[PDB]
Structure to design on (546 residues):
């Protein structure tokens, strides 16, 4: 009786074949408001996926369980994000953090280009200023803080604020290896303002610092009056300057050392 | 329940008319319906493609997809669509509601018949390639296979999506030219990655290139590597401008003082074995 037609045979698409179980490398690098399509997802799976990817909203895009994850936030922490340039995310399980994905783990994602934003500045200021100093990390941090000069208003204020904070700190004791790196990078900046800041910082140093560290810049008069005799700068011969640590020379002295043969 | 007949359409071959008589004659009808829009290698509307087919509740999703050439299909996602009704016995038929044919009628028929099902019309929308697997990521980012890749993972590393994969890839093949195009974007995980590599293998030519990029702007990432490498390799000749072995002094020829040694005076042009503060002054002399 009825003129029956069976539907034309179904031919799926990639979307339809997608499986979120396989997609951690696809989903982690996604950005805010970018809809990451994940295939049909059954209702009894929604909680697992919401657990795993808590920074994302779970959305139903279409029929038959078709779905997507939409990133909402970066909830990775300064302790785990700021003390490294290595990693943009980590997977968390049982109080432990692992670089590699493990099932049962929850993904946390670091804020992008975070160091250029200055949101790590309060963490590293503490961390690097102690026995918690990691030379490589802590140097890198100051280097790149300077590079925020040509970037963003946020990063330029960052730069400014940190610079103010570091002036006041390093005036107290420029020996602390964090302040050594600061001065090192001012020298690298190599403008009038970076030079006179060094001299400013250096000129506020303590009684012991100057005799322990700046003998080249503060010679004894016996030493000083020999220098007058020669048209070679004092630095080109003075044994106190061949030894000395260049990060604690004043600009004049630092300049002068380059002029010898 | 009698004289079922399929009347041809006037215009759309896909469109048809289903005529029918009934035991109750007040239910008599001439229903317009369409089916099987041809397989599409193109779009119905701006960014849209809507097959002339009603997806009854419970019908397999792929049935919408059967009317799109599979290559052209990879880009498109299937979202929800407006309520439609279909003939159970001929499921996937799109009923058009025109004149005598009216939602009341259809609501009513269902009440009295199992010859009516309902669903949503197939609505496809254009986005980009989906990429649901790790290998799919590796192929796109490394550029060993590029063909079915979205822009986010195939823009010569402009955006950052590939940094996770390239972090591990390039650790293994630092010399890879793509690892170098990646590093040339100067985002912090690349630079950081190469500071680790070159701290171990500074003597490679890729470390030369590493240094060549990061300077002038991100020089610290090279200085860090030089320091550790030369700390870990005191026997290497090329290290002695940066860590000169007099026990009291390895800082001896840093900064201004670099011009003092004849060796460190340009002999070879090899920036990498002198720190930034150092090789600035070399030229200054």
């Amino acid at each position: 009786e009825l003129p029956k037609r069976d539907p034309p045979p179904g031919v799926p698409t990639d979307e339809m074949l997608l499986n979120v179980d396989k997609m951690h490398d696809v989903i982690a690098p996604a950005k805010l408001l970018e809809y990451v399509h994940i295939g049909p997802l059954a209702k009894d799976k929604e909680d697992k996926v919401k657990k795993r990817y808590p920074e994302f909203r779970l959305v139903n895009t279409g029929p038959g369980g078709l779905s997507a994850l939409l990133r909402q936030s970066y909830n990775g922490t300064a302790p785990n994000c700021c003390r490294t340039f290595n990693r943009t995310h980590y997977w968390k399980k049982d109080g432990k953090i692992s670089d590699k994905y493990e099932e049962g783990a929850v993904l946390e994602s670091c804020w992008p280009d975070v160091h250029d934003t200055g949101k790590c500045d309060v963490d590293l200021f503490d961390w690097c200023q102690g026995d918690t100093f990691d030379r490589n990390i802590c140097h890198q941090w100051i280097g790149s803080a300077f590079n925020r000069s040509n970037r963003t208003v946020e990063g330029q204020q960052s730069l400014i604020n940190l610079y103010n904070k570091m002036q006041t700190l390093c005036s107290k004791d420029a020996s602390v290896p964090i302040c050594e790196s600061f001065l090192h990078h001012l020298r690298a900046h190599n403008t009038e303002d970076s030079k006179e800041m060094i001299d400013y910082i250096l000129r506020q140093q303590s009684a012991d610092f100057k005799q322990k560290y700046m003998r080249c810049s503060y010679p004894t008069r016996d030493k000083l009056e020999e220098s007058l005799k020669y048209a070679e700068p004092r630095e080109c011969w003075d044994p106190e300057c061949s030894n000395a640590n260049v990060n604690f020379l004043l600009t004049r002295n630092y300049n002068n050392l380059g002029l010898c043969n | 329940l009698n004289r079922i007949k399929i009347a041809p359409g006037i215009a759309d071959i896909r469109d048809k008319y289903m005529e029918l008589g009934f035991n109750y004659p007040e239910y008599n009808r001439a229903v317009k319906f369409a089916e099987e829009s041809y397989t599409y290698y193109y779009e119905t509307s701006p960014g849209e493609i809507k097959p002339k087919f009603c997806l009854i509740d419970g019908m397999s999703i792929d049935h919408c997809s059967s009317f799109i050439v599979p290559e052209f299909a990879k880009q498109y996602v299937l979202i929800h669509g407006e309520p439609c009704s279909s003939f159970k016995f001929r499921p996937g038929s799109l009923i058009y509601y025109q004149n005598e044919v009216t939602p009341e009628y259809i609501k009513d028929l269902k009440h009295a018949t199992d010859y009516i099902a309902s669903g949503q019309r197939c609505h496809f929308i254009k986005k980009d390639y989906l990429l649901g697997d790790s290998d799919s990521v590796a192929k796109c980012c490394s550029k060993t296979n590029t063909k079915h890749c979205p822009k986010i993972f195939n823009n010569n590393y402009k955006t950052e999506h590939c940094d996770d994969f390239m972090t591990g890839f390039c650790r293994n093949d630092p010399g890879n030219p793509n690892c170098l195009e990646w590093l040339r974007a100067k985002r912090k995980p690349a630079m950081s990655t190469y500071s680790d590599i070159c701290s171990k293998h500074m003597d490679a030519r890729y470390c030369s290139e590493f240094i060549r990029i990061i300077r002038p702007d991100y020089f610290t990432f090279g200085d860090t590597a030089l320091y550790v490498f030369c700390n870990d390799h005191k026997g290497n000749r090329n290290c002695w401008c940066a860590n000169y072995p007099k026990s009291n002094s390895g800082d001896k020829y840093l900064g201004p003082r670099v011009c003092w040694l004849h060796e460190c005076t340009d002999e070879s042009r090899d920036r990498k074995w002198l720190y930034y503060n150092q090789d600035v002054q070399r030229t200054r002399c």
Summary: The radius of gyration of chain B is 35 Å. Residues 2-126 of chain B form one domain.
